[PDB]
Amino acid sequence: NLVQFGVMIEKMTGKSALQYNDYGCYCGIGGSHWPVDQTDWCCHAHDCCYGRLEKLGCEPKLEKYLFSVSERGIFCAGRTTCQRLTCECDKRAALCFRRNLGTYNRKYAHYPNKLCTGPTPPC
Ligand SMILES: CCc1c(CC(N)=O)c2cc(OCCCP(=O)(O)O)ccc2n1Cc1ccccc1
Ligand SMILES: [Ca+2]
Ligand SMILES: [Cl-]
Ligand SMILES: [Cl-]
Ligand SMILES: [Cl-]
Ligand SMILES: [Cl-]
Ligand SMILES: [Cl-]
Ligand SMILES: [Cl-]
Ligand SMILES: [Cl-]
Structure with missing residues (x-):
């Protein structure tokens, strides 16, 4: 599940999967307001991706691949x-995470979501 996605993140980024959980405003469950950086945008997109899968009748939060x-x-x-x-x-x-390793910033890990401001971009 997130065993898989987590394992994929570690393979592609050289970082622990937990360094992408709660990153910025979108990495982790849910999300709102404006993404903090390109990595966060990867997460915004991934949420949109899962929403499309849900609309197709899938359960992407549970699917094992x-x-x-x-x-x-x-x-x-x-x-x-x-x-x-x-x-x-x-x-x-x-x-997307790998491609944006250059601007990954440790200060956005475990980002307090009260700091998330501005509009919520559409999918
Ligand atoms: C990679 C950062 C991350 C994302 C991407 C992201 N876009 O948030 C993510 C999405 C999830 O589903 C969320 C279901 C979709 P909604 O966000 O509920 O709409 C659940 C956990 C998530 N983690 C943390 C994580 C992943 C794998 C192992 C450990 C921790
Ligand atoms: Ca999210
Ligand atoms: Cl492999
Ligand atoms: Cl590939
Ligand atoms: Cl996508
Ligand atoms: Cl199917
Ligand atoms: Cl789901
Ligand atoms: Cl850093
Ligand atoms: Cl780092």
Whole structure:
């Protein structure tokens, strides 16, 4: 589940999965207001991704999938299309995290969500 997404995050970023939980305004359960940085935007997008999966009849918060990581990249798999879809959402987020390692800031880990201000961007 988040065992999988967590494992994917660690593989792609070199960081513990817990360093992405509660990051900024969107990484973690829920989220509102304006994303603090590009990493946070990855999380905003991932929430939107899960919302699309829910609208398709999937339960992405619960879906368990399979994946591998080689030189060629992240390969997704699973018995059901919903499992594979969840993997695609997670893959995209984990690649986004890696791509934005340069602006990852430790001060946004465990960000007090009262500091989140401004409008909530649409999906
Ligand atoms: C990678 C940061 C992260 C995200 C991405 C994010 N976008 O928040 C995330 C999404 C979740 O579902 C949220 C379901 C969707 P809603 O947010 O309830 O709408 C649950 C936990 C989440 N963690 C922390 C985490 C992930 C894996 C292992 C340990 C900790
Ligand atoms: Ca979130
Ligand atoms: Cl997405
Ligand atoms: Cl769900
Ligand atoms: Cl692997
Ligand atoms: Cl890839
Ligand atoms: Cl399915
Ligand atoms: Cl830092
Ligand atoms: Cl760090």
